[PDB]
């Protein structure tokens, strides 16, 4: 299945994933697409932070769903 | 149809809406439920800012979807 | 995280909180540390009153931030 990763700056990424893909496996694809390290990605879906160790199906992420990518930087 | 609204770390709340409801209409319902005025609300879905004039169907917001609410924070 | 609560007299107290702790949880911590009931407490950040049901991250209150306690 294919999903989308969207930034509020305008970037739209189309990824082929599986419902059992883990979040960290998705961030590895985003790094290939955008060059942002996984530790510096934060994905948001349904108003929730997508966490390591969980699958896309754990968050009810379905076909052609859109994940919100924000930049996660150590600060403060 | 019933949708959900939450901040990233807050409680999720339920809205009864129609696909033809405008984003301004949705923000007014959030004020009725949660007391947050519309001028202090930012709604995000599918990595897109929900603009007040558009409808929920303009963003393909469907049954049981969850909107990401972000507060508008200003000094004083 | 550690956050600071500043009274009108200038007293700073430190609380150990979580980002998703509610303002309600913060007023309860102030009571356990200073003996001030949450009913008398009014928490302010950047000049805004903080609502009981909201979390610290809802108001973008980072670590080592300072809330202002005003007694009601």
């Amino acid at each position, epitope marked *: 299945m294919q999903i989308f990763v969207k930034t509020l700056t305008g970037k739209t990424i189309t990824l082929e994933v599986e419902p059992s893909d883990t979040i960290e496996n998705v961030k590895a694809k985003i790094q290939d697409k955008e060059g942002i390290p996984p530790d510096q990605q934060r994905l948001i879906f349904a108003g929730r932070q997508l966490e390591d160790g969980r699958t896309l199906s754990d968050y009810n992420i379905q076909r052609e769903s859109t994940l919100h990518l924000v930049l996660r*930087l150590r600060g403060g | 149809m019933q949708i959900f609204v939450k901040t990233l770390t807050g409680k999720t709340i339920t809205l009864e809406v129609e696909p033809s409801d405008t984003i301004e209409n949705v923000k007014a319902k959030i004020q009725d439920k949660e007391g947050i005025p519309p001028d202090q609300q930012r709604l995000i879905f599918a990595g897109r800012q929900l603009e007040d004039g558009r409808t929920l169907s303009d963003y393909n917001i469907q049954r049981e979807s969850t909107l990401h609410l972000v507060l508008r924070l200003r000094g004083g | 995280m550690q956050i600071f609560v500043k009274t009108l007299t200038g007293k700073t107290i430190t609380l150990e909180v979580e980002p998703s702790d509610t303002i309600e949880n913060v007023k309860a911590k102030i009571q356990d540390k200073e003996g001030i009931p949450p009913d008398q407490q009014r928490l302010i950040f950047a000049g805004k009153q903080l609502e009981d049901g909201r979390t610290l991250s809802d108001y973008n209150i980072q670590k080592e931030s300072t809330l202002h306690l005003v007694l009601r």
Partner: nanobody
Amino acid sequence: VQLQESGGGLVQAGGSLRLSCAASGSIFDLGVMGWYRQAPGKEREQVAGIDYGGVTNYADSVKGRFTISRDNDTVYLQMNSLKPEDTAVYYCAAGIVGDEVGWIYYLYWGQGTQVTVSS
């Protein structure tokens, strides 16, 4: 609706630069604003941050040298005593905090401005 940096350039060691971050769509009302930089071969790293209350914080490598400030819809980064190690593309970003401590989720970021510091 975007952020957009300006003010970068080539400067001698010990020189000064003031970066400007212009925001559209009232996007600074997200509450948390920050400057970060990335040099070739290195990772992104936040250098300074400011929240909507005006409270600032800085990386250790720029304390006493950099100053972040704000004028409504413009965030600045006054850079003094610039060193060759400060050479990078500098980005301004705005966002929120989540359930983590010490990490910031930047929703928006600009295209960056190049700062080169040469001896």
